[PDB]
mmCIF file of N, CA and C in Angstrom:
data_model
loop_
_atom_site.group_PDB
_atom_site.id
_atom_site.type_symbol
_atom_site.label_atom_id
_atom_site.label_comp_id
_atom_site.label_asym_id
_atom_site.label_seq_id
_atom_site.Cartn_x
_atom_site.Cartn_y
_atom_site.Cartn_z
ATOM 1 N N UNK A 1037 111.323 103.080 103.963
ATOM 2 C CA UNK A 1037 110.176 102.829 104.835
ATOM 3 C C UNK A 1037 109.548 101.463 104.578
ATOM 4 N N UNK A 1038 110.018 100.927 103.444
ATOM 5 C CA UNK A 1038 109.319 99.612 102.906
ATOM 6 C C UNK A 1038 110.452 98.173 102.956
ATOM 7 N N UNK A 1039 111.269 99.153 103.269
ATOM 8 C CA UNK A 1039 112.357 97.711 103.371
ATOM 9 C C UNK A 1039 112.780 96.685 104.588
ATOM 10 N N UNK A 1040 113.367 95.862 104.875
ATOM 11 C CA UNK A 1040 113.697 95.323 105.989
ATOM 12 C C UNK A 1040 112.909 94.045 105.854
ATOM 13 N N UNK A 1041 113.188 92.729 106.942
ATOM 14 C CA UNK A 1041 112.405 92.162 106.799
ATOM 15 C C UNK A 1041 111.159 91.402 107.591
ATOM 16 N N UNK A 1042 110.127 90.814 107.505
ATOM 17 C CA UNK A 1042 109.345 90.676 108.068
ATOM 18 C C UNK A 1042 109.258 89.999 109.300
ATOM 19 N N UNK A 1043 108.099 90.666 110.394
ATOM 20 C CA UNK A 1043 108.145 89.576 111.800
ATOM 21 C C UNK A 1043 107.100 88.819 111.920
ATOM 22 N N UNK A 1044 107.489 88.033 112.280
ATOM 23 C CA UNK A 1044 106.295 87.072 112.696
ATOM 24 C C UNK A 1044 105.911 86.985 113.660
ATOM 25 N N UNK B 311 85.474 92.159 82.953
ATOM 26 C CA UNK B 311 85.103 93.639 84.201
ATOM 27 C C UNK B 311 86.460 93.473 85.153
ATOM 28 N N UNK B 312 86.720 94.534 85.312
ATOM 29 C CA UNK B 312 88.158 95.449 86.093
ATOM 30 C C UNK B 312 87.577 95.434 87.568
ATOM 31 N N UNK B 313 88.518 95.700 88.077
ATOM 32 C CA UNK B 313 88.453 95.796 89.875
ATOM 33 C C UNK B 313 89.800 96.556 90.564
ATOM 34 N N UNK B 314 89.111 97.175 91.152
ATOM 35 C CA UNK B 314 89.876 98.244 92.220
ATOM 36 C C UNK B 314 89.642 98.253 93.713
ATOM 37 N N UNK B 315 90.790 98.338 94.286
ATOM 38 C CA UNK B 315 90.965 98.595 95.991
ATOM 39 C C UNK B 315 90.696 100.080 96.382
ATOM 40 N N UNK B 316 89.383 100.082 97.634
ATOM 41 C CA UNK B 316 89.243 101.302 98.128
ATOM 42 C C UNK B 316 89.453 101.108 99.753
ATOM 43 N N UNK B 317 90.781 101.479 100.253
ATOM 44 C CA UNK B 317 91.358 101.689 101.201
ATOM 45 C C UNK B 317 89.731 101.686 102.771
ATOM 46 N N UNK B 318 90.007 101.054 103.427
ATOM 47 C CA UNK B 318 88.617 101.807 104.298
ATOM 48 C C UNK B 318 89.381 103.087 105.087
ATOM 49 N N UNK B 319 90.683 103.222 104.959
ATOM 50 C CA UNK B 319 91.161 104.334 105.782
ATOM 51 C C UNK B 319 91.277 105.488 105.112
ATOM 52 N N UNK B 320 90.403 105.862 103.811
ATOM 53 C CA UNK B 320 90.123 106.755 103.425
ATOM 54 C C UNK B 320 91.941 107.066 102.123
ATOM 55 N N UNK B 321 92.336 106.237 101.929
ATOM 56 C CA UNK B 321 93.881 106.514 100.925
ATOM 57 C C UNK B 321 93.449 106.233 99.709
ATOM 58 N N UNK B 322 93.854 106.520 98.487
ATOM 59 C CA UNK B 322 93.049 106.984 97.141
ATOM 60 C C UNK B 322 93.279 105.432 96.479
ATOM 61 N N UNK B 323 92.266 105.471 95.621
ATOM 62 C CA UNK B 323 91.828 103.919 95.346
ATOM 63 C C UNK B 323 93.110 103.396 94.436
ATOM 64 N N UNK B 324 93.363 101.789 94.548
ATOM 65 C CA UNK B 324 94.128 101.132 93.801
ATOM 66 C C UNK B 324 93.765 100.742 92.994
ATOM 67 N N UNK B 325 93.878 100.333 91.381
ATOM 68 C CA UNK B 325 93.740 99.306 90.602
ATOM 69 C C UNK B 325 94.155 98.412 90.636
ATOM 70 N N UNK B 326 93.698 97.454 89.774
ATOM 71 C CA UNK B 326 94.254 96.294 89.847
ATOM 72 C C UNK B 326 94.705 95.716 88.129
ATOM 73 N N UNK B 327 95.691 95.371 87.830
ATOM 74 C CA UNK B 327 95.888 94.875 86.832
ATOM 75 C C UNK B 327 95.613 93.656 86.853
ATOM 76 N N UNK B 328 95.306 93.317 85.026
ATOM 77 C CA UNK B 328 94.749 91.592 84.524
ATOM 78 C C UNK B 328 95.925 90.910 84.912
ATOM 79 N N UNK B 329 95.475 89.651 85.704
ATOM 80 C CA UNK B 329 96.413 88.374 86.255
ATOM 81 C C UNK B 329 96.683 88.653 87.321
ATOM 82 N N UNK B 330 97.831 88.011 87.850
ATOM 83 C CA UNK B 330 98.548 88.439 89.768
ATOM 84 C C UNK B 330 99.038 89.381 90.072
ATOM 85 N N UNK B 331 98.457 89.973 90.944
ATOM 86 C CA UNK B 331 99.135 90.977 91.498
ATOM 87 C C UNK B 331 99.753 91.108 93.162
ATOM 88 N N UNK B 332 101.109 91.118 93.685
ATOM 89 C CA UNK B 332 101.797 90.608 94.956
ATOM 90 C C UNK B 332 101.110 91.782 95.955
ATOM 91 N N UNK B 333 100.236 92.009 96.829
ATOM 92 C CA UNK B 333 100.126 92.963 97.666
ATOM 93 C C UNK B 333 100.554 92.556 99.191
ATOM 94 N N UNK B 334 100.645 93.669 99.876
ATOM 95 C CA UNK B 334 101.981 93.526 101.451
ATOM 96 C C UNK B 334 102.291 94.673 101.555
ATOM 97 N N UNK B 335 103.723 94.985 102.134
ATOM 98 C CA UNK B 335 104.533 95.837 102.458
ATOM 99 C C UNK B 335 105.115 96.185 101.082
ATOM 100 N N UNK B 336 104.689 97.586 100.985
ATOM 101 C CA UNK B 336 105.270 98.185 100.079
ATOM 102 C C UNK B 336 104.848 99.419 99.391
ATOM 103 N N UNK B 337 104.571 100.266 98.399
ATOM 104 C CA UNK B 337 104.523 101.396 98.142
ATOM 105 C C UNK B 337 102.753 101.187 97.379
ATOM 106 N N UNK B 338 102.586 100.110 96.487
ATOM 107 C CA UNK B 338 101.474 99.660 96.346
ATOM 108 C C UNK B 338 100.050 100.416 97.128
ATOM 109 N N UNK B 339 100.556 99.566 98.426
ATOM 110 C CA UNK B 339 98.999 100.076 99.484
ATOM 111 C C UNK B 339 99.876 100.614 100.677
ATOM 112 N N UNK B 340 100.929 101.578 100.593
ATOM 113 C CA UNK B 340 101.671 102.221 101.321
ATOM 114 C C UNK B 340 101.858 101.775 102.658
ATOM 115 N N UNK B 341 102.047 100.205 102.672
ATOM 116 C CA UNK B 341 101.777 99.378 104.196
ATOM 117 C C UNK B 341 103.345 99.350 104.321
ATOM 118 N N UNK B 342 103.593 99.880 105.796
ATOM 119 C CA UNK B 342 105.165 99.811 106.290
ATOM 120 C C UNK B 342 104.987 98.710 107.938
ATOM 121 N N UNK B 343 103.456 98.437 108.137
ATOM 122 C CA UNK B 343 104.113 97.310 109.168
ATOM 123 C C UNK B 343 104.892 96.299 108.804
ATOM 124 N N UNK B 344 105.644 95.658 109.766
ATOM 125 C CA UNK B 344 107.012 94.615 109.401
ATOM 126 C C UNK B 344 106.309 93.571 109.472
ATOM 127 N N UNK B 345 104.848 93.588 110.475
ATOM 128 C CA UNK B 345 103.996 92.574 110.652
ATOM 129 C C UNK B 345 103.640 92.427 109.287
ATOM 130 N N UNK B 346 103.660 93.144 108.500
ATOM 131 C CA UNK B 346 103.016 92.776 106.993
ATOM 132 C C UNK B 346 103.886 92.222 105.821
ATOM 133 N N UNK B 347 104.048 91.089 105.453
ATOM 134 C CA UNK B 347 105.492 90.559 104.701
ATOM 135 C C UNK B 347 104.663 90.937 103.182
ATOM 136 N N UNK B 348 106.407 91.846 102.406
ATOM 137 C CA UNK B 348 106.018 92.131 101.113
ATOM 138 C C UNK B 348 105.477 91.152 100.023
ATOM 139 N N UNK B 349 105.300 90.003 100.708
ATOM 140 C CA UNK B 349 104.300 88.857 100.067
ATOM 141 C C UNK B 349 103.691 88.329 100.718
ATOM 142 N N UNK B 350 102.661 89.439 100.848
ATOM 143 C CA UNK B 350 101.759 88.690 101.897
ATOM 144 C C UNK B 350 100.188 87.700 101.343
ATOM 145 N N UNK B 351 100.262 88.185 100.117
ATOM 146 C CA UNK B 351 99.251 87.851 99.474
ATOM 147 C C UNK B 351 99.145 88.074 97.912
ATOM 148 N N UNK B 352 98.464 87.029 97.016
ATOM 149 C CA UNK B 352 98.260 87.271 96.057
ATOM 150 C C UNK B 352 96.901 87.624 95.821
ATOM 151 N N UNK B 353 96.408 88.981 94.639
ATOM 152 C CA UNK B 353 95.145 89.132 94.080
ATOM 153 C C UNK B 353 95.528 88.776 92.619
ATOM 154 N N UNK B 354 94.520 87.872 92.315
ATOM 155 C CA UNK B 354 94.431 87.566 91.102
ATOM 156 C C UNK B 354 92.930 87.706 90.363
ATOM 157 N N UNK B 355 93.025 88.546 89.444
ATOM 158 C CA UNK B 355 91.753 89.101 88.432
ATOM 159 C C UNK B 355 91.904 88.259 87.197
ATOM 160 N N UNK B 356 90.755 87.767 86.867
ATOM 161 C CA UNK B 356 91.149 86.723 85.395
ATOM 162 C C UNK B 356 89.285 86.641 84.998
ATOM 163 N N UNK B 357 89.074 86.722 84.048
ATOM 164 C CA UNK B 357 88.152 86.420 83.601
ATOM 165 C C UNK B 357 86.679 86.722 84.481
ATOM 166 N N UNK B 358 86.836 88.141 84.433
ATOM 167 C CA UNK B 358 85.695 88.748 85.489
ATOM 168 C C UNK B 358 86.001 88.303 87.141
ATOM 169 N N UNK B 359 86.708 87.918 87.440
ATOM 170 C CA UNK B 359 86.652 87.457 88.988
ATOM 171 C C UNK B 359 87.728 87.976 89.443
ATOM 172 N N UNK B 360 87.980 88.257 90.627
ATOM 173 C CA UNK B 360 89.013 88.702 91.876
ATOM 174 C C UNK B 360 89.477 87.683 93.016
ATOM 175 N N UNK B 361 90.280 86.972 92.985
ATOM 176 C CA UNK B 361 90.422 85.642 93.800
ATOM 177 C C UNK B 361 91.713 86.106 94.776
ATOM 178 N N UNK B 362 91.257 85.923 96.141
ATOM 179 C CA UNK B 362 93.034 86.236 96.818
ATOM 180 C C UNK B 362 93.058 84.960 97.557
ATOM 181 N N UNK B 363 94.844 84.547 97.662
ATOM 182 C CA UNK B 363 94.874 83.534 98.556
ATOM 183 C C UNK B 363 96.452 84.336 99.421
ATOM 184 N N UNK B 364 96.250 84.051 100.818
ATOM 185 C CA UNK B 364 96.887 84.441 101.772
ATOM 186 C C UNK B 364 98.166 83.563 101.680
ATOM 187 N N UNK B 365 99.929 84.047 101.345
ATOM 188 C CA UNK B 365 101.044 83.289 100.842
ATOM 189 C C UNK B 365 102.142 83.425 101.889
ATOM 190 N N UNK B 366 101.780 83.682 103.190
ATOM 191 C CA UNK B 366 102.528 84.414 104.278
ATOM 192 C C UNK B 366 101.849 83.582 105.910
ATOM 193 N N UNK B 367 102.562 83.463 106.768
ATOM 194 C CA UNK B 367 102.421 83.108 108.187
ATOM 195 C C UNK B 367 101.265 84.045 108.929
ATOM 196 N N UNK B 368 101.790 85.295 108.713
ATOM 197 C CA UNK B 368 100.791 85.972 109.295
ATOM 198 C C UNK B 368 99.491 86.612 108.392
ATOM 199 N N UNK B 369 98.252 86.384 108.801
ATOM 200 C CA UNK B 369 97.068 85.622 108.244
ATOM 201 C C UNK B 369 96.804 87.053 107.409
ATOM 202 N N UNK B 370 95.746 86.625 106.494
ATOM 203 C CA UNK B 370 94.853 87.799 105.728
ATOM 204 C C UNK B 370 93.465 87.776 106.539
ATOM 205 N N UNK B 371 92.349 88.228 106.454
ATOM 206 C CA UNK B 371 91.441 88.637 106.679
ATOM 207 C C UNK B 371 90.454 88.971 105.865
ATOM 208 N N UNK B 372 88.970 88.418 106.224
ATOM 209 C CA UNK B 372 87.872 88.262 105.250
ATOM 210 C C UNK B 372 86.917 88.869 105.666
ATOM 211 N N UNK B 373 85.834 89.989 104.868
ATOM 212 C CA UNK B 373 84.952 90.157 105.935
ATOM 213 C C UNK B 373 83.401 90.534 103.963
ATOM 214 N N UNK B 374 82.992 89.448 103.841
ATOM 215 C CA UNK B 374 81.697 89.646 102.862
ATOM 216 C C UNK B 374 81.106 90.875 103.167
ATOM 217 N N UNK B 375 80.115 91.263 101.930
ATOM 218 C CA UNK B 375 79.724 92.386 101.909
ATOM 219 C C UNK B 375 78.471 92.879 103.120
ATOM 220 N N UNK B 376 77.508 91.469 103.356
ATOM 221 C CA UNK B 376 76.213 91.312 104.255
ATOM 222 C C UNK B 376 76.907 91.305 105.581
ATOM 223 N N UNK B 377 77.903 90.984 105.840
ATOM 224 C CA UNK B 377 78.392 90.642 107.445
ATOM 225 C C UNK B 377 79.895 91.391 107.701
ATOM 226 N N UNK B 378 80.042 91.649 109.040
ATOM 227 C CA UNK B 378 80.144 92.400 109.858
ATOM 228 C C UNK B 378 81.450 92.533 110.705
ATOM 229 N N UNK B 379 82.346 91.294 110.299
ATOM 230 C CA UNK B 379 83.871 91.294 111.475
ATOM 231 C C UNK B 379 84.481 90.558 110.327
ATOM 232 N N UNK B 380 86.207 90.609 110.466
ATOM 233 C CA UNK B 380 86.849 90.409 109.666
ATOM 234 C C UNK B 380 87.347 88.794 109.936
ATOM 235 N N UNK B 381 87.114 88.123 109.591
ATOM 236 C CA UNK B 381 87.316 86.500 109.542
ATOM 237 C C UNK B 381 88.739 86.265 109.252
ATOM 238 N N UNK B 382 89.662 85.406 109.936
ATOM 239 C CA UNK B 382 90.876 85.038 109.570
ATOM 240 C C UNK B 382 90.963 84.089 108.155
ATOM 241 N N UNK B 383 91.824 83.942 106.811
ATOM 242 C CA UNK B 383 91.429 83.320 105.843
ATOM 243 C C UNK B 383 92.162 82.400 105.830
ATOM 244 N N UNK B 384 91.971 80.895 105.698
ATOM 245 C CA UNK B 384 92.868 79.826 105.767
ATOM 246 C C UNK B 384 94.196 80.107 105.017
ATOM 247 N N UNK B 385 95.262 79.450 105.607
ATOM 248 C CA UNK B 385 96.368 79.806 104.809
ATOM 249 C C UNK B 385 96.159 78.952 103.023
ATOM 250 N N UNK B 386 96.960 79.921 102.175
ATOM 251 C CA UNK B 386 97.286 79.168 100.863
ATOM 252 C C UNK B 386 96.141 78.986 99.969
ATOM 253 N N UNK B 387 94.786 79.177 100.673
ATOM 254 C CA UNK B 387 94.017 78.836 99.686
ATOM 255 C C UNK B 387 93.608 80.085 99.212
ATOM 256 N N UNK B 388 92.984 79.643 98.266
ATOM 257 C CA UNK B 388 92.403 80.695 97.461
ATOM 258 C C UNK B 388 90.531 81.291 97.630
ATOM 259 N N UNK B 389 89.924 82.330 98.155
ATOM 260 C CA UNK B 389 88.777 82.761 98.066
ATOM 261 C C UNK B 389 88.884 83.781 97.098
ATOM 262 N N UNK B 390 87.031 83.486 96.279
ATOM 263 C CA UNK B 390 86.959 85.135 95.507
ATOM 264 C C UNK B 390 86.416 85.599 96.449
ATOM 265 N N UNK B 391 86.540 87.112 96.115
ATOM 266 C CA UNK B 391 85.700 88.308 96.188
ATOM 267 C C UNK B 391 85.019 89.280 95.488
ATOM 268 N N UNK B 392 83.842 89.223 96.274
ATOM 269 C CA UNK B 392 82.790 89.822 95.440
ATOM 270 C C UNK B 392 83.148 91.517 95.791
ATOM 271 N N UNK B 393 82.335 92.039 94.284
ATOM 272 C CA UNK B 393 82.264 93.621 94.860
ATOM 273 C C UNK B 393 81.313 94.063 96.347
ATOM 274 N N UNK B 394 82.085 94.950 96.995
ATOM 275 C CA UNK B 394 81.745 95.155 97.900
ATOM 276 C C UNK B 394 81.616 94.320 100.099
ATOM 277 N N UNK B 395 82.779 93.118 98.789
ATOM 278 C CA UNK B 395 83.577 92.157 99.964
ATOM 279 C C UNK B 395 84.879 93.293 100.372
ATOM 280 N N UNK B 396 85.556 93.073 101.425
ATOM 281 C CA UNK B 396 86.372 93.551 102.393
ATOM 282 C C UNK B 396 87.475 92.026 102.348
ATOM 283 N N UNK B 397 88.836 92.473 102.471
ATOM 284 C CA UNK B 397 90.266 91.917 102.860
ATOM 285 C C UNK B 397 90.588 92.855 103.641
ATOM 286 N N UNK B 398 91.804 92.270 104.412
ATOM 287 C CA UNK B 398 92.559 93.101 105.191
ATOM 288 C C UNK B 398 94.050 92.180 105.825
ATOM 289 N N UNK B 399 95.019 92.509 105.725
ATOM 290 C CA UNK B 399 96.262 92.585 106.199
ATOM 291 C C UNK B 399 96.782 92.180 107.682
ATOM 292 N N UNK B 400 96.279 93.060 108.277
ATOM 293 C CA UNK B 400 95.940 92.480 109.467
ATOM 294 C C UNK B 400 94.453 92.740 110.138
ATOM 295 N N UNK B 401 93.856 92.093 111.662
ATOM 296 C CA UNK B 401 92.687 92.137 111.825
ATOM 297 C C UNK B 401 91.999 93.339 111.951
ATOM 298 N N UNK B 402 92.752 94.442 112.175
ATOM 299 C CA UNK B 402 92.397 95.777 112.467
ATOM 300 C C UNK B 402 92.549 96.609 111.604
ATOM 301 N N UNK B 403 93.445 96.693 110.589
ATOM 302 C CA UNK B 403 94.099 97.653 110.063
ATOM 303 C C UNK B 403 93.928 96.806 108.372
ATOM 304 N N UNK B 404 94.860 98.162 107.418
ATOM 305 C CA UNK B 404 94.610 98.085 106.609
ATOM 306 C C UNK B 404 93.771 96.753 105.619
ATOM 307 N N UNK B 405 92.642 97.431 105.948
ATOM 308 C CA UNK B 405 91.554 97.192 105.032
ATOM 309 C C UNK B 405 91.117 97.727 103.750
ATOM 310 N N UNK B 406 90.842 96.920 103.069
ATOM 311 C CA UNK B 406 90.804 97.125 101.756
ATOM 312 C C UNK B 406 89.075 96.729 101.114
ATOM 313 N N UNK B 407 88.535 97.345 100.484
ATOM 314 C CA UNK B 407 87.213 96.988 100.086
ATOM 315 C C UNK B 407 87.136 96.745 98.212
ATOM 316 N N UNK B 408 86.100 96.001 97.961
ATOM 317 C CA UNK B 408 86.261 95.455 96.635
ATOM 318 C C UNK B 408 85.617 96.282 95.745
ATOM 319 N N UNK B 409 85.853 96.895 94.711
ATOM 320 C CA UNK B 409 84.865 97.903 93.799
ATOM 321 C C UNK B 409 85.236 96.776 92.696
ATOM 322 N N UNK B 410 84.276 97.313 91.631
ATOM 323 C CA UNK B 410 84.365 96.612 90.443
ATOM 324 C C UNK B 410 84.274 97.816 88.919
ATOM 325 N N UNK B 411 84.728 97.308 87.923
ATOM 326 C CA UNK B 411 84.573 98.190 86.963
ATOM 327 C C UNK B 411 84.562 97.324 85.741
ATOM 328 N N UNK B 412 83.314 97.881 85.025
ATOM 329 C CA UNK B 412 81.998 99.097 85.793
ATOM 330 C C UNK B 412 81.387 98.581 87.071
ATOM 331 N N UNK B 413 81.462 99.730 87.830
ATOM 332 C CA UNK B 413 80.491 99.569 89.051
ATOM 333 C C UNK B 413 79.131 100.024 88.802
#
């Protein structure tokens, strides 16, 4: 649930 | 003096350990938006004080203890916070309020 990566 | 995060969405309070601590996405403050990068910010506690500076594109949020809306916080720099100052993640959502210990 905490992984992946971020959007901007 | 120690300092702890009290969720405003009612989720059970955080501590904070002496020196930096990375808060964002992650199990920490149980934040799973993607809008929220797992470095989104540093809190740093050192010598009685609580200082965060925003380390991410998408902004942190400021809101002092006397006033009333959450202020966008310049990137990179560093503000303290006082007990009973407010951060937040994004402009709406997870918010975080400042306790101190001893309170």
């Amino acid at each position: 649930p905490y992984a992946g990566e971020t959007d901007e | 003096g120690g300092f702890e995060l009290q969720p405003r969405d009612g989720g059970p309070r955080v501590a904070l350990a002496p020196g930096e601590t990375v808060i964002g996405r992650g199990p920490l403050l149980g934040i799973t938006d993607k809008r929220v990068s797992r470095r989104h910010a540093i809190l740093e506690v050192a010598g009685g004080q609580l200082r965060i500076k925003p380390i991410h594109t998408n902004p942190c949020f400021y809101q002092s203890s006397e006033k009333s809306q959450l202020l966008p916080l310049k990137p990179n720099l560093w503000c303290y916070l006082n007990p009973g100052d407010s951060f937040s993640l994004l402009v709406d959502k997870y918010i975080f309020r400042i306790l101190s210990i001893p309170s």
